[PDB]
Amino acid sequence: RGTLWHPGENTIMGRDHTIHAAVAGYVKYYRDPQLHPDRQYIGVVFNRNDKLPYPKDAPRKRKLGLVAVPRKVEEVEKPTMSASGLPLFVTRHETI
Amino acid sequence: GSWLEPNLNRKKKMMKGRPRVPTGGSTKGTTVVWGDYGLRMRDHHRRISAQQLKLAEDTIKQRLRGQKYRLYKRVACNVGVYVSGNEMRMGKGKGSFDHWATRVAVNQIIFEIRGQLHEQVIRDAFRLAGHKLPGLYEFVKKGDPPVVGITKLEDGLTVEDLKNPRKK
RNA sequence: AGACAACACUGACUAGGAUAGCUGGUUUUCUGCGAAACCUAUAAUAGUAGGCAAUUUAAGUAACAUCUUAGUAGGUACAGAACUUAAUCUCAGACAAGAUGUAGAUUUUCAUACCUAGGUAUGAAAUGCAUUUUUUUUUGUAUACAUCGGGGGAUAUUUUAUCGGUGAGUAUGUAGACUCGGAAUGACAAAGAUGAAUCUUGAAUAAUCAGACAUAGAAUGAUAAGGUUGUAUGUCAAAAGGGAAACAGCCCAGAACAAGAGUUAAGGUUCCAAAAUUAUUAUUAAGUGAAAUAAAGAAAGUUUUUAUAUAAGUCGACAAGAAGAUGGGCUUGGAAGCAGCCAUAAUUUAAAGAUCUCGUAACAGAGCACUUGUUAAAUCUUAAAAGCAU
RNA sequence: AACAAAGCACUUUGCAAAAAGACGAUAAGUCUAAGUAUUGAGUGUGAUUUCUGCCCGAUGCCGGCUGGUUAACGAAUUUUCUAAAUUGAAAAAAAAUUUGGUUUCAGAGGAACCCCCGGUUAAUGGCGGCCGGUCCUAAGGUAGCGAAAUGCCUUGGCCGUUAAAUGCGGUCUUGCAUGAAUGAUGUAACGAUACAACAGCUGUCUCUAUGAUUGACUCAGUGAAAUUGGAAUAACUGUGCAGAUACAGUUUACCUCUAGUUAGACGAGAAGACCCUAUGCAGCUUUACUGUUACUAAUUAUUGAAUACGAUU
RNA sequence: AAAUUAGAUGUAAAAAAAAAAUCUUAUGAGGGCGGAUCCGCUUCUAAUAUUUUUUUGUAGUUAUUAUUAUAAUAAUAAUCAUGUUUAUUACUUAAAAAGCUUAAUGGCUUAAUCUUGCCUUACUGUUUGAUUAACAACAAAUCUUACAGUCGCGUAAGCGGGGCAUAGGAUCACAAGAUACAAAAAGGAAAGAUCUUGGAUUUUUGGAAAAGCUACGCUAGGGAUAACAGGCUAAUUUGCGCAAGAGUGUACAAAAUGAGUGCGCGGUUUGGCACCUCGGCUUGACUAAUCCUCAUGGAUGCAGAAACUAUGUAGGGUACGACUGUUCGUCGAUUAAAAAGUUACAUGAGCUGGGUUAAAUACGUCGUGAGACAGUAUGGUU
């Protein structure tokens, strides 16, 4: 009820102040006096050995989170007549 | 308010509670601080009423009337005791207000006194007050060491010595 | 009269057609495993369903349990008085400089009217005591400029060791809805190791849903109940056996069947009754006690310890003394140490309270505190505390 | 002391085809009654003396408007689908109208009950507070009675009765919570009703004794019953599903019968008695729920005409 | 006393440089050694932080003073300021409180408050992962993710599927829209299906349209919940003791007396719990906290007598009558005295049945009524 803990590294806060994980990692409870000297945060790190808060001068630690698959090249072959020999669409234009 | 009639609401009912039982070496309230002599409860922790403390005060005044003295009180009746009827059955809510009371730990001071009187005249006044109070009481002088539980810190005895596992 | 209508009548008898979430009963052996008396829902609360979950035996296991190491969540015991609550205690005011009036010593400096660069004076200052100083008609520094009403008394008026209120305090206490500090325990997950498969899933498929007591800690009651109701742990329930005289719940220990002066647990060892009349040091004299602690309290019971007195005669007894101003002043019919009130610096003595206990209407009188002497103890006085007893 | 009762009172019944009332799966019909308002039925009260007060607001019943409401009926309204036709659209097309069938909506007028007005207390029922004054009600308990069969306080006060009166009688009353045909009140007579007192009388008692018969007891003959887990079935204290012949400890006791007695065997018998539980029953009550009737009202049909008036407008 | 307005912390704002060490980090050197990127060891470099660290510098400008010959040097003071001083900017200013839809708790002040601009995402469909597998089941729920569609705000990054968080019930039936699914011979339709939406003290709120009496009562059960007794307990008691001693006692605490109290015993009264579903007569037994009889201490208040108090002591006795159903209580008259208690408040397979007391009946009160009453009255298989 309210923000006793605040969302830190790789976490999102819900409408009811519920803190979730935004990535696959390991939960961490810590404090960050650089960001706020009176708050305590919850984080999620990709490596169980990482220590939060990260130094402000170090590169962000982020994971790709994607899988490689062959691209799908579309074919322009949509017929105009259906299997029943009927037009799949009829176009009409008005005249003034 | 007063030490027998606090500025509290009689409607808000209080749980029975328990007197403090210092098990970590606390000497809180076991020494004479204001007066020269004191009355110490030396047997067990209890809950004294406001009518018992009022009678004890009257007994010290009846014995010291016509003399110069300053009586201090180190306890305050801030505990509401709610008594349901003895003729009632169990349940049906908590009882109604009966009287005020105070919780006293063991070896704590109740009354202190300072005046231009003789020691023996004060011993008798505290003896009578102790006779009418619940439990067993003792005469204490200013300067006596504090008490940790039921053990007095006499002859250079400290709290760390009582905490030391090795005592033989 | 709910009276009678052929054993029956607040609605007969007989034949045909019921239910009962309630009570009782449910019949051979062996073997393996083995609960629950809790949650949720219910026209429920004696019932029932779904879970937790007992069982069967296959498929899995990076299963489950425990410990170690590192890590994390959370505020109990405790402790404390910070914030909050009750009550209580203390303080509410200081210095420096300046200013003010004074008593001095009459040396020095300075300003002055002079005399002739000195001096008679004449003023101030210096030196020593006071006084003024928390908002003043006294500035500064350091501090929370640091305090108001009412009611008595004093003289519109002032003053308080009186009440309430404000400010200050690293003052005292108080705690289910105070926690600045803060355990152990328990909880979560990771790795490793260990272990009695204890775990999960598939398929199949139950019972149970007033629990009881012990221990700790609470609410409730009356700090009563073999009371009621949560939490933690165990036992009983469904567990025999040994101990607790007898014993569901306590202390041990989990019965497949025998043998053994076998090895042990709790518990015991003079006899009943298996095993010590086994060793050491003390206490008790009361059968206290010895397997269910009655209290406060009293007291030349006894022991120990710690102080203390003693041939400078302790302790006890005995002998004598225990004055004088003075019948203190007042009060009172009377108050002479001794109804009551006020005072209770002295004086002289080996010592002697303007008086501790009796006594007189008031005096008188007998004791005490106190003083000397005699008798007399060579581990032998007095007191307190503690232990065990009465 | 309840019921009935003579007496008293109220309501109802005109008899012309059925008097009312009762009975009739429901009628014809029967009793009423071969009766007729001084008859029959229903209701309450309960001879007689002395009396029976106030309130018609509520409830019930009765009567009453050229009234309101008013189901059925019904002037005036309205809709779904489909068939055909017409119009329309005539582009991939609906849509609208009329008619047939089919299926809905709809209410000016129009009964009783009800609304409204009045009557009725020997109808069901009601019959006051505050401090002479005052507020309120339909009306405020009148007459009489009154510690009563009514009274919690209470053994009310006083008088009589008793050596001693929570009783009985008389009397006063501010009567928790008397009261006038759910009748009020007082006598005569009557009562196996209830209460109280006096005299007499007595084994009721002080306080029992003796005597008689039948049983009880013994012998002979005949020969049950409830009951019964099995029993070698003592006392005390303790223990324990909490009151022990049976467990612990200690004590005590030779074996076995007869007649007495009933302290215990939580003695026996009766699911006897009470309380609670069941989404178990029964009867009864009512302004419980849901229903059926008696009865009332309107109307198609059996069922055809005339006249006038009144009200809608 | 209470109306409005204005106030209520402090600091900083020319500018640094250099050496070592302690870690911690690095998608730095594609470092090196093993098993460019992963893991374990690791040297160097760089960055943040830390040291009270070894320090160096602390000017310039304006002016003042001193020295030197308007300038130089030193010292002192001031110094955010090229900017409409109402300056501005950054940091700091305990806790509580205010505000944030409504109580309370937590939270927000760096926004979740306030102000303003433009807006309606308080969107449509489907869907992820959780609430240590929501409520110790299921269901209704809560939080959250992604994709597609198309709207808003914003320079942009991005935010938006109502509100700072935690308090509003289904199905069925009914009603309004959409979908084009099926259409009982066939073409239509009716009645159905799917999606969206609406109306509920369905408040016994997982959701029945629902008043009583029985003492004339009945059946199945419970003692899983009562009344008597027993058991546990001891608040209370018309049961007692001890301690202390205000006070009374002409004097004088303790002859007698004993405020409000404290520490206990006991199991008589009224109660709690829920282990467990009357009185009289006759005849006893037992206790001792004693009314009489026996021995005895104390008693300005024991002359004697009588009585008071207290210590021993339970052998025997404690009667008769009136009233009341009574135990109890009141009263009369005697007596040495006319005391208590336990025992299933001893004793109904020993007796009694007056009280309580089922069916009958009346009165008062209560109830619309049937009926009821800790009421009253007469009667009622022991």
Ligand SMILES: [K+]
């Ligand atoms: K009337």
Ligand SMILES: [K+]
């Ligand atoms: K009427």
Ligand SMILES: [K+]
């Ligand atoms: K009328």
Ligand SMILES: [K+]
């Ligand atoms: K109509």
Ligand SMILES: [K+]
């Ligand atoms: K009258």
Ligand SMILES: [Mg+2]
């Ligand atoms: Mg005491």
Ligand SMILES: [Mg+2]
């Ligand atoms: Mg009857």
Ligand SMILES: [Mg+2]
């Ligand atoms: Mg009958």
Ligand SMILES: [Mg+2]
């Ligand atoms: Mg097993």
Ligand SMILES: [Mg+2]
């Ligand atoms: Mg269990």
Ligand SMILES: [Mg+2]
């Ligand atoms: Mg239901």
Ligand SMILES: [Mg+2]
């Ligand atoms: Mg049931």
Ligand SMILES: [Mg+2]
């Ligand atoms: Mg903390």
Ligand SMILES: [Mg+2]
């Ligand atoms: Mg229990």
Ligand SMILES: [Mg+2]
């Ligand atoms: Mg069982």
Ligand SMILES: [Mg+2]
């Ligand atoms: Mg066992």
